[PDB]
Paper text:
We report the X-ray structures of the unliganded [name] [name] and its complex with octopine as well as a structural comparison with NocT and the related [name] LAO from Salmonella enterica, which binds amino acids (lysine, arginine and ornithine). The mature [name] [name] (256 aa without the signal peptide) expression plasmid was obtained by cloning the [name] gene lacking the first twenty residues of the signal sequence that serves for localization to bacterial periplasm. The X-ray structures of the unliganded and liganded [name] with octopine were solved at 2.35 and 2 Å resolution respectively. The liganded form adopts a closed conformation whereas the unliganded form adopts an open conformation. Indeed, superposition of the two structures results in an average RMSD of 4 Å for all Cα atoms and a structural comparison shows a 49° rotation around the hinge region of the C-terminal domain (residues 112–226) upon ligand binding once the N-terminal domains (residues 21–107 and 234–276) were superimposed leading to a movement of 10 Å for Thr163.
Residue numbers in the entry: 21 to 281
Write the structure that this text describes.
Amino acid sequence: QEKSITIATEGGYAPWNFSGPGGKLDGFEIDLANALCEKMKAKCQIVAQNWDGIMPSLTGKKYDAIMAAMSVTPKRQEVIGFSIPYAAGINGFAVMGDSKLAEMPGLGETYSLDSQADAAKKAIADISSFLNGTTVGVQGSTTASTFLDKYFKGSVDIKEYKSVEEHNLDLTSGRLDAVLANATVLAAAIEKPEMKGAKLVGPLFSGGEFGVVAVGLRKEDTALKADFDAAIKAASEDGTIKTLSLKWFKVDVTPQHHHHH
Ligand SMILES: [Cl-]
Ligand SMILES: [Cl-]
Ligand SMILES: [Cl-]
């Protein structure tokens, strides 16, 4: 009876999905896939693969599902099917603890830009005047880069970087006073030893503009989408996602109801 589906991942984006000794895949998405497959009553094989042909391999029926921090976009929806989201994009600020900026009492608030925009707009105003005149770092060509441009332009000096590590290295130096980045990336980076003193400050921002992550499936595989959708829904309500999210990321990525069928 039981379905045997192959799940593809990148294997090079810790703590979401990362490589092992001979071939042991680990991370948030691996523990989540194992959990969803148990909810589905399916046998699953997780394979790591270069993103290049992940993709023609899925449309070619070599793979049946993709779990590689894959954002739902209008372009991807034209070519592939998507499950309901299993993670929502979250951005936050990090400063050095010994700095006067380390006390934005907006900790540890979490505001949706879609369902709590009122609380979000009031919070970004509190921040814009606290951060007034400061040099804020960000990785160029991201949702955090766009967010900082839309709401924090004029209030702060914005410096774009080509990696999170490069802006984090200039925060410890004093070159930058604050960084804004994906909260899963940020909490991981501040665990590095040359990153001691740095801490997550102010509120967490979630919303559709930060994107959402879901399972990539064949556009024709409507039954597999129905199976993933039921398991994702159950994993969201019983707190399986919150658990794994906090375990790997120290932040809760569980999405909201409005990102439904
Ligand atoms: Cl584990
Ligand atoms: Cl098959
Ligand atoms: Cl959901």
